[PDB]
Design a binder for this molecule. Structure first.
Ligand SMILES: CN[C@H]1[C@H]2O[C@@](C[C@H](N)C(=O)O)(C(=O)O)C[C@H]2OC[C@H]1O
Length: 256
């Protein structure tokens, strides 16, 4: 039989979440979400079973000072996993080191905060000094700021980096808790903002999207699966299945 593919992923609502049960769940049955439905579809089309493994360091992946990678990206580079199926942002810097599928969902960076301020844009946010801000550490949002040559965003990076110990959070939940309980705004992908702001009516998006990109399935460079995964994603896109999956996991219940 075809070797069971190792899938690296990360907990992130509503892409990958622990299933709630009153009885024991083992292996892949512990997980549900958009990316799990995507895996069920892709695996049917390509003819494999898989083993879902949460990335040990709990990171999406960025480079350090020395150019060493971490997170899911490192798992692919080091051939620890066959596929990364997660909301993994397709970027120039990553595409040089792994082979991404074509995108299955689009997004852009925006701002998550509480309601009631006159802050209306990243320009406003960088200018004012009342509210701090940051991003999840070692993801594409952090890296976007780190690499930007746009003045406002260069300033924002310098700020995040200066108070990194503090401004950069471990994961979305730490970020969201910081937004709810302190004067802090989170730079966050629009897909995730849409999800949270329809569930917690104290939260809102600030401004529009500051970039435009997509999520893809990651594979190691040279992977014999990447092109087949791309073909399967296009099939699912054309058949309307990706749209249906988004509606399934983003639906309910609502805020004004
Ligand atoms: C899937 N989106 C969420 C997550 O996306 C990340 C990871 C990113 N999607 C990546 O592939 O590195 C980000 O950097 O915005 C980390 C975390 O941040 C909050 C929110 O944007």
């Amino acid at each position: 039989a075809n070797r069971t593919l190792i899938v690296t992923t990360i907990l992130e609502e509503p892409y990958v979440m622990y299933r709630k049960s009153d009885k024991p769940l083992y292996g892949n049955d512990r997980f549900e979400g958009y990316c799990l439905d995507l895996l069920k579809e892709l695996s049917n089309i390509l003819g494999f079973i898989y083993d879902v493994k949460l990335v040990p360091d709990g990171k999406y992946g960025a480079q350090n000072d020395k150019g060493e990678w971490n997170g899911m990206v490192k798992e692919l580079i080091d051939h620890r996993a066959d596929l990364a199926v997660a909301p993994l942002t397709i970027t120039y810097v990553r595409e040089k080191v792994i082979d991404f599928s074509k995108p299955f969902m689009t997004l852009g960076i925006s701002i998550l905060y509480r309601k009631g301020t006159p802050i209306d844009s990243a320009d406003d946010l960088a200018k004012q000094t009342k509210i701090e801000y940051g991003a999840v550490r070692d993801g594409s949002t952090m890296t976007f700021f780190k690499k930007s040559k746009i003045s406002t965003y260069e300033k924002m990076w310098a700020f995040m980096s200066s108070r990194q110990q503090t401004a950069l959070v471990r994961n979305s939940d730490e970020g969201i808790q910081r937004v709810l309980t302190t004067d802090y705004a989170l730079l966050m992908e629009s897909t995730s903002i849409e999800y949270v702001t329809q569930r917690n009516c104290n939260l809102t998006q600030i401004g529009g999207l500051i970039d435009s990109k997509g999520y893809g399935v990651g594979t190691p460079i040279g992977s014999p699966y990447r092109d087949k995964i791309t073909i399967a994603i296009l099939q699912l896109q054309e058949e309307g299945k990706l749209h249906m999956m988004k509606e399934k996991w983003w639906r309910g219940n609502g805020c004004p």
